[PDB]
């Protein structure tokens, strides 16, 4: 079950394919594509407007029919330079990412069955929690903290 | 969406346009114009009676009709020199800040649609929560932390995919 | 609104004129007058029995008719030498200050209108919370914390 | 009003009068007389079987008849020096202090009116909270914290201005 | 009242009489005798299978009939020195101690009257709450925290 | 009672017997044999895809019929080296552990009676609570914490003294 890096990769792929050089209205970042999950922390990232996805703690609760609900959290960070203005561009980026999370359907989902093929599925819901922002320190750079929760039912049932 | 920084910019513009060299009754600081969000912290600020607006964490919940309720927290700080007295001038400056934050209408918006023009919008309600004051240290200067919350309805960018 | 240094100065003035060299009954500290708000901390204060008023966190809540009720906090400190005994004199100090808090009316108050004159007003109610003291350290001196709350409605209404 | 120092003084006087070489039954410490609130901390105190009553933070609430309920906290500390066992004698002394605080009447006062005489008053009730015990370190010495709280009705110095 | 070191000594005597060289099969420890309250911390204890009793914080409640209830806590520690496996022998010891606490009756008790004789009494109930285990550090030795509560009404009533 | 080490040993025995070179469908990490409670921490463990079962604090309550409810916690940690990807391999291993927790039967015991034989018993239910992983530091290595709770009814060694 779990399928956590699957969630992360699905979100990254969705964001990349919905932001890359298309639909200039309703989306304003013009990312050639930089979003990923392998490279983060701060070191590396020599390119900017770069958005990284973290993978955090998840909590599960049991239903008495084999059903599984798994509340899982993806911390999100955004780094910006003074293209125009740090606060302005940062809010532009966070509005863009929140829009791409909310306005479009549910995530395509790319589980890997043991010694088989991928059975595409979906993720139930999205809830976006508190949104934070960097402080005055580190003036030329910027940070934007996003807390989003995902809940999915893994394609299995108990005994 | 979000409109955060747009909210802060509209609020600071309202402050500047409302407490500058006009209507000296019920409002007296005669700021040539100082308040902004671009420059803050403490370094710089050669001018005083300088009130600054910061950007804080949001909080959100979903209502089952496409509308989402979000609380914006704007911790705004007050800096002032000695003059006649730190306490009296500080409190009356924050009193002016609160009377302009409450008495005069609601907010305005100058939000920008993606690669388009700015369509005005509105902020639903504003509540000013706990307000603090600094201590004796740094005597000729002084801090005055006042925390405000903004309840705004973002444009419902659902049902239109 | 706010109007807090006026609250502090009103409390200081009330204590001073209600405790200075008059009514030997009820009150006895014979404070010729030391109480203030400009000078505190500990450094300076060469005179004793001195009582100082602090400035604390405020709290506000809204009523849906323009009415504003503002919870306020004034920590109070008292510093004493050995006239007879630290505990005894510090304690009848805190007793006298609590009595001047409680027994006499509401505040006579000195709010200041912008570019106008003072419209004397009233403060609704006062609640005295925990009263603390110091530790055995600093034997020749003494400290005693007082936590009071000023509950007032600012003389203004919303739109 | 408050009277917390007078409460401490009356309680220590009761301890001294009720432990000193009298009532050999039901009471076993034979304090010739040691207990006080004047000298405490640890430094000094060349005598032992010593018990010291600290006077601490309080709590209060308001009732709509002029009467005020005050919760006073009196941290009580005890000390011992071997002479058979730390644990047995510490238990013995804390048991004696607990039976004094419990089974013997109510609490007397010796409060002083403004520039007048002393009119006796009483404490409404006593309640004893957790009683801690120190650890092994400082082997020949020992501590056992006793947290007691009293509820007293102070003289209702309202309605008579 | 209080009667705390008497609780500790009664527990120690009970464990000694129900562990030593007799009643095997009921519980497993062939402990000749090591349990005590005078010697603890870690230093001393040259021998192993040591079990120690601590004396901890108690809480009391007052009933409006002179009745007295006292919620008292006795942390318990057990030490071991292999001869097989740390986890195996440690759970062996904790099972032994939980059995000796639970299976047999209430506590026989040896409270001491003022300048008189001992009036044996009873302890109402025992509840054993969370049981802990040490960390991998200090491999040749072992630790396991035992937390129990004893309920006793002291043989006296109020006025 | 307790059974903590016995529960852990039976759990890890089920892990090793179910992971090794069999049923490649639905289950693939191919632990030849490795995981146990004897060796853990980090020092040693030259072999990876290694998962450790620790023994943690428990919780208990009493019900008025002699039966004891004991809530026991097993912190489980996952270690993995880079083969194709740290994230993919760590996720798949934790998924395999979780499906061992869920889809396979109940938990067996091998508890030994005092100076007697081993009569097997069962575990009531398994609940797997929050599970977490490490961060970027120690890049070629990885950590994945698993917190699992086991509810067991210990043999009612009451009413038969």
Note whether E159 contacts D105, CB cutoff 8 Å. Answer: yes
Which of A96, A74, A72, A73 lies closest to A18 in space, CA to CA?
A96
Ranges of beta strands (E only) in C16-144 are 51-53, 59-62, 68-78, 125-131
Distance CA F39, CA D5 (A): 61
| B55-66 as b/e: b if 16+ CB within 10 A | bbebebeeeeee
d(CA A148, CA A99): 13
Closest CA to A77 of A94, A56, A101, A102: A94
Burial class (CB in 10 A: 0-12, 13-18, 19+), D7: buried
Distance between CA atoms of residues D97 and D105, nearest Å: 14
Asked if the structure places residue A157 within a domain, the reply is no
Q: Does E127 touch chain F (CB under 8 A)?
A: yes
CA F56/CA F72 separation, integer angstroms: 7
Q: What is the CB-side half-sphere exposure of residue D41 using CA atoms within 13 A?
A: 10
Show the tokens assigned to C81: 């030498």
Number of B/C CB contacts below 8 angstroms equals: 61
Residue C43 contacts D, CB cutoff 8 Å: no
Phi, psi of D5 (to 5 degrees): -65, -40
Q: Does some domain include residue A159?
A: no
| Minimal-distance CA residue of chain D relative to E1 | D95
**Per-residue CA distances from E135 to E52, E113, E140, F79, F145 (Å):** 19, 44, 12, 18, 16
Q: After which residues does chain D have a break in its backbone, defined as C to next N over 2.5 Å? A: none
Give the integer Cα–Cα distance in Å for C140 and C86: 8
DSSP assignment letter at D151: E
In a domain, A139, yes or no: yes
Which residues have a Cβ under 8 Å from the Cβ of A78 and sit 6 or more positions away? A49, A50, A51, A52, A90, A93, A94, A97, A142, A143, A144, A146
Angle among Cα F100, F105, F108 to the nearest 5 degrees reads: 95
A133/B57 CB distance under 8 A: yes
User: CA of B126, closest CA in chain C: separation in Å?
Assistant: 11
Residue B158 lies in a domain: no
Distance separating alpha carbons of residues F142 and A4, to the nearest angstrom: 15
The DSSP 8-state label assigned to residue D36 in this structure reads B
CB D73 within 8 A of CB D149: yes
What is the least distance, in Å, from the CA of E95 to any CA of chain F? 5
C-beta of residue C87 within 8 angstroms of C-beta of residue D5: yes
Helix (H, G, I), strand (E, B) or coil at E17: helix
Residue A109, strand partner residues: A121
**Coil/strand/helix, residue F93:** helix
C92 DSSP 8-state letter: H
Burial class of residue D4 (count of CB atoms within 10 Å of its CB; 0-12, 13-18, 19+): buried
Q: Which helix (H) or strand (E) holds A85?
A: none
**What are the angstrom distances between the C-alpha of E99 and each of B32, C44, F121?**
81, 67, 18
Backbone phi and psi for residue F68, each to the nearest 5 degrees, phi listed first: -105, 135
Q: Which residues contact A95 (CB under 8 A, 6 or more apart)?
A: B1, B2, B3
Q: Show the CA angle centred on residue C118, arms to residues C117 and C119, nearest 5°.
A: 115
Q: Is F18 exposed, middle or buried (0-12, 13-18, 19+ CB in 10 A)?
A: middle
> Rounded to whole angstroms, what are the CA distances from E45 to A145, D10, E7, E78, E139?
53, 47, 22, 11, 17
Tell me the nearest-neighbour CA distance from E25 into chain D, angstroms: 34
| Helix H or strand E segment including E91 | helix E86-102
The residue whose two tokens read 């959100």 is B60
Angle, CA of D130, E129 and D142, to the nearest 5°: 40
Query: What is the per-residue DSSP string for B88-136?
Result: HHHHHHHHHHHHHHHTS-------B-TTS-B------EEEEEEE----S
User: Six-digit token pair at F50?
Assistant: 């290694």
Produce one character per residue of D96-110: b if its CB has 16 or more CB atoms within 10 Å, e if not.
Answer: bbbbbbbeeeebebe
Neighbours of C75 (CB within 10 A): 15
Question: Nearest-CA residue of chain F relative to E137?
Answer: F41
CATH of the domain at F130: 3.30.2000.10
Question: For residue B58, what are the β-bridge partners?
Answer: B72
Instruction: Determine the Cα–Cα distance for residues B90 and B151; give it in Å rounded to an integer.
Output: 27
- Rounded Cα distance, A76 and A90, in Å: 13
Q: Is D122 helix (H, G, I), strand (E, B) or coil?
A: strand
CA–centroid distance for A44 within its chain: 19
E115 belongs to a structural domain: yes
Contact E2 D94 (CB under 8 A): yes
CA distance C96 to chain D (A): 8
Q: What is the residue whose two structure tokens read 């919905």?
A: A18
Domain of C80? 4-152
CB contact under 8 A, F136 and A1: no
**Chains in contact with chain D (at least 3 beta-carbon pairs closer than 8 A):** C, E
Beta strands A68-78; A144-152: pairing state: antiparallel
Handedness of CA A8, A10, A16, A18 (dihedral sign): negative
Elucidation method: cryo-EM
In a domain, B160, yes or no: no
Count of structural domains, chain D: 1
Query: How many other CB atoms are there within 10 angstroms of residue E80's CB atom?
Result: 23
Chains D and C touch (3+ CB pairs under 8 A): yes
Which CATH number goes with the domain that contains C39?
Answer: 3.30.70.1700
Cα angle for residues F43, F45, F51 (degrees, 5° grid): 115
Q: Is B77 helix (H, G, I), strand (E, B) or coil?
A: strand
What number of residues does chain C have?
159
Q: What span, in angstroms and rounded, lies between the C-alpha atoms of A76 and A98?
A: 11
Q: Give D23→chain C minimum CA distance, Å.
A: 32
Nearest to A144 by CA among A102, A92, A90: A90
Matching residue, tokens 């009939």: E65
H/E stretch holding F14 reads helix F4-19
Structure tokens at A75: 């911390």
Which chain E residues are within 8 Å of D88, Cβ to Cβ? 5
Q: Which two tokens stand for residue F19?
A: 């992971």
Burial D48-85 (b: 16+ CB within 10 A, else e): bbbbbbbbeebebeeeeeeebebebbbebbbbbeeeeb
Separation CA F119–CA E9 (nearest Å): 36
Chain A within 8 Å of F98 (Cβ-Cβ)? yes
Any idea of the CA torsion for B92, B96, B99, B100, to the nearest 10 degrees? -170
CA D34 to chain centre: 13
Instruction: Yes or no: say if D112 and D120 are a contact pair by the CB < 8 Å rule.
Output: no
Length of chain A: 159
Give dist(CA C63, CA C69) in Å, integer: 8
What angle is formed at CA D110 by the lines to CA D108 and CA D112, rounded to 5 degrees? 145
What is the rounded CA–CA span in Å between residue A28 and residue B114? 6
CA atoms within 13 A on the CB side of D134: 19
DSSP string, F18-47: HHSS---TT------S---SSS-SSSS--S
Q: For chain D, count helices (H), then strands (E).
A: 2, 7
Structure token pair of residue F91: 């996720």
Task: Give dist(CA D7, CA D124) in Å, integer.
Answer: 12
Whether D76 contacts D150, CB under 8 Å: no
| CA–CA separation, E94 and E79 (whole Å) | 10
Q: Check CB contact under 8 Å for A87 and B158.
A: no
Q: Are A127 and A149 in contact (CB under 8 A)?
A: yes
Taking CA–CA distances from C157, the nearest residue in chain B reads B103
Q: Give CA–CA dist C135/D56, Å, rounded.
A: 9
Q: How far is CA B139 from CA B142, C3, C51, in A?
A: 7, 21, 20
Closest-CA residue to E7 (of E152, E140, E118): E152
Q: For residues F123 and F106, is the Cβ–Cβ distance under 8 A?
A: yes
Place of tokens 């904790």: E94
d(CA F8, CA C87): 60
What's CA E134's distance to the chain center, in Å?
19
Q: Rounded distance, CA E79 to CA E82, Å?
A: 10
DSSP per-residue letters across D51-96: EEE----EEEEE-TTS-EEEEEEEEEEEB---SS-HHHHHHHHHHH
Q: Does residue B8 come out as left (phi exceeding 0), alpha (psi in the -120 to 50 range) or beta?
A: alpha
């Amino acid at each position: 079950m779990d399928h956590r890096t699957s969630i992360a990769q699905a979100m990254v792929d969705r964001i990349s394919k919905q932001m890359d050089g298309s639909q200039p209205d309703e989306y304003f970042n013009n990312l050639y594509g930089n979003v990923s999950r392998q490279t983060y922390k701060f070191e590396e990232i020599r390119e900017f407007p770069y958005v990284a996805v973290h993978i955090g703690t998840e909590t599960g609760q049991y239903l008495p029919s084999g059903q599984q609900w798994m509340f899982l959290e993806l911390p999100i960070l955004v780094y910006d330079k003074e293209k125009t203005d740090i606060q302005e561009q940062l809010e532009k980026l966070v509005a863009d990412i929140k829009t791409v999370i909310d306005t479009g359907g549910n995530l395509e989902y790319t589980v890997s069955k043991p010694n088989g093929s991928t059975f595409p599925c979906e993720a139930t819901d999205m809830i976006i929690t508190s949104v934070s922002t960097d402080e005055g320190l580190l003036a030329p750079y910027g940070l934007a903290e996003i807390n989003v929760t995902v809940r999915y039912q893994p394609p299995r049932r108990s005994l």
